[PDB]
């Protein structure tokens, strides 16, 4: 900190008002649009859909 802390960045950007959408890994590098993309590198629910 002080600037390095992500809380200060969130307060400055105003995203704290909508922090409910805080994605795991929200940082300056590799924001949600990239964190979600990378998470795909980490389909078998065997659900029974009604094909009507």
């Amino acid at each position: 900190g002080t600037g390095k802390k992500e809380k200060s960045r969130r307060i400055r950007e105003g995203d704290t008002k909508d922090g409910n959408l805080r994605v795991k890994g929200e940082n300056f590098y590799r924001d949600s649009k990239r964190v979600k993309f990378l998470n795909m590198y980490t389909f078998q629910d065997s659900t029974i859909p009604d094909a009507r």
Binding site: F43, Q44, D45, S46, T47, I48, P49, D50, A51, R52
Partner: protein, 35 residues
């Protein structure tokens, strides 16, 4: 055929003598699962 023989869609003159409630046909298809 022999027994039957022993007893005894109009088409144009040029086509003769020649070779011839909105449900889908297959509702409720098999439930292929995510597997």
């Amino acid at each position: 055929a022999h027994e039957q023989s022993k007893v005894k869609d109009a088409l144009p003159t040029y086509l003769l003598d020649r070779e011839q409630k909105f449900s889908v046909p297959l509702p409720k298809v098999r439930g292929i699962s995510e597997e």
